[PDB]
C-alpha cells in the first residue's frame, strides 16, 4: 500500500534528487524508469508524520538554482568578442530547463504554495514573497545575467543593426532570439 504518512530523512532523499535535478536544467538523458519513480518521493516529503518538510525543500532548491545561474555568469563575462552566440546557446537550453522541471514540482505548486501567497486583489490597489517553482527560475535570469550585463548586449546590437543598414549579412536567428528573450 505504502501511501500512508511515514517518517523520512531529508539527507537521503535530497542527496538522490540532486543528481536527476541537475541533468534536467541542461539537456541530457535520464532513464524512463527514474523519471516515473521520483514522482513518489516529492510526495512523501510533503506528508511526514513528525512535521512537514516542504519549506526546507523550497529554501534548498532556491540555493541550488543560484549557483547554476552564477557560474554561467562567470563563463560568459569572460567570453571575448563573441558574447552574442554564447548568450544564445545557454538561453535556449535554460528556457527548456524550466518547464521540464515545473512538472516535477506540481504538488508543491498546487497544495503548499498558492495557499499562502498573495492574491491578485492584494497585488492591485496596494495594501495586501512566495512564488511558484518554474517561474522562480525566470527571476534569477533577470537579476544576475542581463542586468549586470546590459551594456555590451545593447552596444554590440545597435552597431550590427547599423552595419546591416549599411550593407551586411547578419544571422537573423541569432539576433531574433536575443531580442525575443526580453
Amino acid at each position: 500500500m505504502s501511501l500512508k504518512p511515514r517518517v523520512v530523512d531529508f539527507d537521503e532523499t535530497w542527496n538522490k534528487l540532486l543528481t536527476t535535478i541537475k541533468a534536467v536544467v541542461m539537456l541530457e538523458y535520464v532513464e524512463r524508469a527514474t523519471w516515473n519513480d521520483r514522482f513518489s518521493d516529492i510526495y512523501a516529503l510533503c506528508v511526514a508524520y513528525p512535521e512537514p518538510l516542504g519549506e526546507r525543500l523550497y529554501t534548498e532548491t532556491k540555493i541550488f538554482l543560484e549557483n547554476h545561474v552564477r557560474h554561467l555568469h562567470k563563463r560568459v563575462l569572460e567570453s571575448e568578442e563573441q558574447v552574442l552566440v554564447m548568450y544564445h546557446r545557454y538561453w535556449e537550453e535554460y528556457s527548456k530547463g524550466a518547464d521540464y522541471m515545473d512538472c516535477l514540482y506540481r504538488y508543491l505548486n498546487t497544495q503548499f504554495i498558492k495557499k499562502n501567497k498573495l492574491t491578485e486583489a492584494d497585488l492591485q490597489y496596494g495594501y495586501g514573497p512566495l512564488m511558484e517553482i518554474g517561474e522562480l527560475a525566470l527571476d534569477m535570469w533577470r537579476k544576475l545575467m542581463v542586468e549586470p550585463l546590459q551594456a555590451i548586449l545593447i552596444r554590440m546590437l545597435l552597431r550590427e543593426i547599423k552595419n546591416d543598414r549599411g550593407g551586411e549579412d547578419p544571422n537573423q536567428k541569432v539576433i531574433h532570439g536575443v531580442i525575443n528573450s526580453f
Binding site: 501511501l3 524512463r32 516515473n36 514522482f39 513518489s40 510526495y43 512538472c103 506540481r106
Partner: protein, 92 residues
C-alpha cells in the same frame, strides 16, 4: 492511441489515451524526457484500487452533458479510504 498502466502488485491494465488524460499527474508523467519512445510504472498502488480508478473514467466520459438522470457509483465501505488517498495522488 493506447497507454499501459503497471501496478505495484504486477497486474497490467490498458485503456485508451483520451480516456486517461482526466488526471493531471498522468499527463505530467507523459510530458518531458518521459515521452517513452507507453507504459507508466506506479510504485505504491495496489490492484483493487487501480481497477476502480480505471472504471471511473468511462463512467465520467459517457454520462456527461446528458439529460438522462445519472445513476450512483457503487463504492464498498471496506476500501473507501484507499480511493481517497489515491485520488489525492492522481488528482482525479
Amino acid at each position: 492511441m493506447y497507454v499501459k498502466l503497471i501496478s505495484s502488485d504486477g497486474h497490467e491494465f490498458i485503456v485508451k489515451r483520451e480516456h486517461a488524460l482526466t488526471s493531471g499527474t498522468i499527463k505530467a508523467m507523459l510530458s518531458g524526457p518521459g515521452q517513452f519512445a507507453n507504459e507508466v510504472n506506479f510504485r505504491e498502488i495496489p490492484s483493487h484500487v487501480l481497477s476502480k480508478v480505471c472504471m471511473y473514467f468511462t463512467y465520467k466520459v459517457r454520462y456527461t452533458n446528458s439529460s438522462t438522470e445519472i445513476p450512483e457509483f457503487p463504492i464498498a465501505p471496506e476500501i473507501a479510504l484507499e480511493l481517497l488517498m489515491a485520488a489525492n495522488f492522481l488528482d482525479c
